[PDB]
Amino acid sequence: SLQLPWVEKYRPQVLSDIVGNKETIDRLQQIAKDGNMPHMIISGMPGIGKTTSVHCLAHELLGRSYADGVLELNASDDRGIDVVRNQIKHFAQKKLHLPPGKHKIVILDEADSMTAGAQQALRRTMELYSNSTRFAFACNQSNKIIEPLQSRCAILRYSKLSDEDVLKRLLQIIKLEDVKYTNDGLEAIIFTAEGDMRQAINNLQSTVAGHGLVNADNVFKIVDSPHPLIVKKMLLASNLEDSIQILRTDLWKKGYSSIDIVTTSFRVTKNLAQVKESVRLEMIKEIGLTHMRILEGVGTYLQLASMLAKIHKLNNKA
């Protein structure tokens, strides 16, 4: 059949389990405890726990009335002008008896995909029925929501999860799941996560399912991305012929497109520490020039070879 993914099997059902953004999570906990939930637009990068936060807040706020007091509208559901003018308005006008302070919650998840006219129609709906219902948006980009909607909500900008919180929750999951872990493997999981917590959990699950013990090499086998050590050796080699051979064999012939190679090189160089800050920024400038040339349309092998040549000049000389 199927096994429940650790992304879903270990999803926080309470607001306290959610790590990262401690101030916002604590204030949301206080709101859920007391009540009078304001209109909010929770925004940020993918995978930091926005939708989970909204659902946990709604659950804690309502309780047994969650089924008849929360209306969720994702992108799969229709959110046109007709939907806003009929379904949301009738839900707001619905008479549900809730404990004092609690209010009905209209969770409009992925509000950045909603049309502008629907957002305009939602403004009067939330302004009129705010004494019975409260709206909660969740968008990846906060600029796609119109200013009239943003002037009636408390914008929440969730930040990228730091290495400490991801490491803490990963240690929790590894401890309740009896997973053999190594420091290098966990560090690789954090590095490949890049703040995407869902990615970290998925990578841990894949590594455990495939290669058992979580070593760094095992983690770098299920990421289908250029190996950071291979890219670092390519960039930091003192012989240009070796760097060219590495780029030709381990990256170009293996099917890694120019965008992935440039992204991995940029990430490695940004994480590099033995070189000076000025050298770091100049190599980053060369990588940016190569990425620009790729975006224009010139993403051939010769551009990456010239990038390696410039980085070699910068490292060996100066």
């Binding site: 806003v84 003018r85 129609a121 009067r124």
Partner: protein, 44 residues
């Protein structure tokens, strides 16, 4: 609304019919309603 409150002296006295964007502001949906509201007296 505040001007209405000051003019009438009471919240219940003034009757402001707000035509917001959350409804269909088309001729065949609101012309008769608005004409009847602005033509006769409110029941009070």
């Amino acid at each position: 609304q505040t001007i209405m409150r000051e003019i009438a002296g009471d919240d219940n006295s003034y009757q402001i019919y707000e035509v917001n964007s959350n409804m269909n502001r088309s001729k065949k949906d609101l012309l008769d309603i608005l004409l009847d509201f602005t033509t006769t007296h409110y029941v009070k």
